[PDB]
Structures are given as structure tokens and as C-alpha cells.
């Protein structure tokens, strides 16, 4: 994450509202996915902050 280079925000709101049928109750859920369009470019490979270690593993 970098400021100059930042991309925006994504929000979601009720346009009208969720309505449940009779005999039904509680919360309903949305699942959300993300994938890249065919548009996408990635460059200049580097090391990931997502994995590290303190001693070599063994068998």
C-alpha cells in the first residue's frame, strides 16, 4: 500500500432493502469473490511478506 499510488474504495448499500418471506427469519449472507480482468499486468518480482522462518526445517 502506497498513497500516491492508491486505488479508491468499494462500498455497498441497500438500494431498496432485503425482504424475507413469511415463516423465515434472521440474517442472510452474501459470499464475495475477487479475480483479475484479462487487462491485468503484474511486474518486477520480489519476495512475499507472507512467509518467513527462523530455523531450517528438517525431516
Amino acid at each position: 500500500p502506497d498513497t500516491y499510488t492508491s486505488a479508491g474504495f468499494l462500498s455497498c448499500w441497500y438500494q431498496t432493502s432485503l425482504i424475507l418471506p413469511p415463516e423465515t427469519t434472521g440474517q442472510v449472507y452474501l459470499l464475495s469473490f475477487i479475480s483479475a480482468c484479462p487487462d491485468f499486468k503484474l511486474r518486477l518480482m520480489k519476495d512475499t511478506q507472507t512467509i518467513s522462518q527462523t530455523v531450517a526445517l528438517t525431516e
Partner: protein, 255 residues
């Protein structure tokens, strides 16, 4: 597998999808178009902001309850404050526009209720005082709030009696105007495309509204047992083919 039923309208940087439409009406069978030269009078080149003004603005939501009488919005007023559409509006001497109106109201297969969605070209309102009392400016320029036909008479405001369309004609005959119904059992949206209708080629956007959009409950809302007794109605509207002309200082309007 195309149904009359599912639709997508993309206009500018905004898109609407409905999975329960009932076709769409195009007023008087004409689609909005720009102002041709043969019809032009003002010699000024006009400004066509295109995608920055021709996108969808969603007005604040209303709440249909069993006591609702109906709501009324005027155009271009309702949009007087939306993004760059509104700025352009206050800043040019003249402007012209068509619109896509999308009214939304979803419920379930146990609800009943039916709204009339109608567009009335030149809807001159009546004073509830009678005689020749006028309807002051502010009252006919409610902005995004629109007029709530179940609100009380106010002074200098219009009459809000529904079976008379706010003008001395019967609710039953509003069907001669481009309109579409939202019947919970069928429909969940209404869409009307409005071409620019006037007796002059371009006009002032602030001293004259050229259509009122009206949403009126006709078959009362009836919710399933122990359901909450109300549904929200949302109105989203997009200017289309907008042109502004005679730029200058920026109008100052009452109130």
C-alpha cells in the same frame, strides 16, 4: 433466453440491472436526441458534458405504507443538486435534456399492491386555495425530496388531492400519459425513457420544469401476516443527451 423481464441499462459510469422488469416505455415512441440545427435559434455552440452528466443519480428513498397517497418529483428540479449535472444547470442560461427514469420496489410473492408510475409533460399544479391564488416557486421546486401528496396543505403550495392529479383532472385518466405499473405480483421496477418535450428548442432549467414524474399507490400495499407493514420505493434517474448553452455567472434562485 432474453426475457422482457431482465434488463441492463449502462449510462456513463453507472449500470442498473433488473431481473423483473415489464418492458420499458419510451414516451410518445421517441428516444432522446440532441438539438438539430434546423430547429436551433440561439447562435451559441452548446456544451455536451456527456458521461459526466449522463449517468444515473439515485434520489433518496421513500416509504410506502398503507396510508401513502403518492409522491411527485419535477425535472430537471429533482436533479438540481446532483454532481456536475446540477452545476451546469445553475451556470448556463439555457440547457435541454431527456432522461431514463427507473423506479424500484421489490416485495415477496405474498405481498400485493400496485403503483402507477407516470410522466406528465407540463404538469401545471393547482393552488388548494381556489380562485386565482398562485403556487409559489419554492413549492414547485421541492428538489430531490419531491412533493408528498399525503403531507398537509401549506400556504402558497399546491393542492395534494390524489384523485385530481393536483390539477382538476381524474386519477383514472393519467393513463393517457406515458406510464407503467409496478404490480408486486408481476413487476418490481418501471422504466420510462423521456425525450425532451417543449414548445421552444431549449429553455431555462430553473424557471420551468418540463415533466413531473409521479408514483401513486393505487391498489394499497398489503403485507403478509405479521410482516412489517411497509416497503421502500427508490427512484434513480439519468439525464441523457444533455446540452447546456449560454454560460455565465451562475443563477441565484429563491430560497
Amino acid at each position: 433466453g432474453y426475457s422482457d423481464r431482465v434488463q441492463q441499462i449502462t449510462l456513463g459510469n453507472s449500470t442498473i440491472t433488473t431481473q423483473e422488469a415489464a418492458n420499458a416505455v419510451v414516451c410518445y415512441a421517441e428516444w432522446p436526441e440532441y438539438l438539430p440545427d434546423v430547429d436551433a435559434s440561439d447562435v451559441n455552440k452548446t456544451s455536451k458534458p456527456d458521461t459526466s452528466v449522463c449517468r444515473f443519480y439515485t434520489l433518496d428513498s421513500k416509504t410506502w405504507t398503507t396510508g401513502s397517497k403518492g409522491w411527485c418529483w419535477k425535472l430537471p428540479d429533482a436533479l438540481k443538486d446532483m454532481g456536475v449535472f446540477g452545476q451546469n444547470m445553475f451556470f448556463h442560461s439555457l440547457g435541454r435534456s431527456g432522461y431514463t427514469v427507473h423506479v424500484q420496489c421489490n416485495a415477496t410473492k405474498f405481498h400485493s399492491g400496485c403503483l402507477l408510475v407516470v410522466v406528465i409533460p407540463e404538469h401545471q399544479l393547482a393552488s388548494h386555495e381556489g380562485g386565482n391564488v398562485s403556487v409559489k416557486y419554492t413549492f414547485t421546486h421541492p428538489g430531490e425530496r419531491g412533493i408528498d401528496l399525503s403531507s398537509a396543505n401549506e400556504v402558497g403550495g399546491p393542492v395534494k388531492d390524489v384523485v385530481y392529479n393536483m390539477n382538476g383532472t381524474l386519477l383514472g385518466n393519467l393513463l393517457i400519459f406515458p406510464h407503467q405499473f409496478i404490480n408486486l405480483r408481476t413487476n418490481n421496477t418501471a422504466t420510462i425513457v423521456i425525450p425532451y418535450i417543449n414548445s421552444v428548442p431549449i429553455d431555462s432549467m430553473t424557471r420551468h420544469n418540463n415533466v413531473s414524474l409521479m408514483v401513486i399507490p393505487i391498489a394499497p400495499l398489503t403485507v403478509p401476516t405479521g410482516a412489517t407493514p411497509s416497503l421502500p420505493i427508490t427512484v434513480t434517474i439519468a439525464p441523457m443527451c444533455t446540452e447546456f448553452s449560454g454560460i455565465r455567472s451562475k443563477s441565484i434562485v429563491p430560497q
